[PDB]
Amino acid sequence: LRQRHTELEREVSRFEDQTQQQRQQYAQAKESLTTLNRLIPQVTLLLDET
């Protein structure tokens, strides 16, 4: 069971890391989407590059 503990700690580290990265990148992409639809939710149409 202590060897099982070692493997469990390995798995916990792996999942913790993977979740941390994935959530960081996906949250940054989400913030990118929010910046788009906040600063330029087709506000470029009002800008219209006239």
């Binding site: 700690e9 798995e11 959530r23």
Partner: protein, 49 residues
């Protein structure tokens, strides 16, 4: 910041792409945590044993 010029001239479609990404966020996290969370309980159980 994401993409380097990345068709900013007319970027509409990318937003929809991001929606898929956004979806994959929740999934990608909802599973992940649970898994570690799962083992947490098991770990505790193992410790108790």
């Amino acid at each position: 910041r994401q993409g380097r010029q990345y068709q900013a001239e007319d970027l509409e479609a990318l937003q929809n792409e991001l929606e898929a990404r956004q979806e994959a966020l929740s999934l990608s996290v909802n599973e992940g945590g649970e898994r570690r969370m799962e083992m947490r309980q098991e770990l505790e159980q193992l410790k108790q044993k």
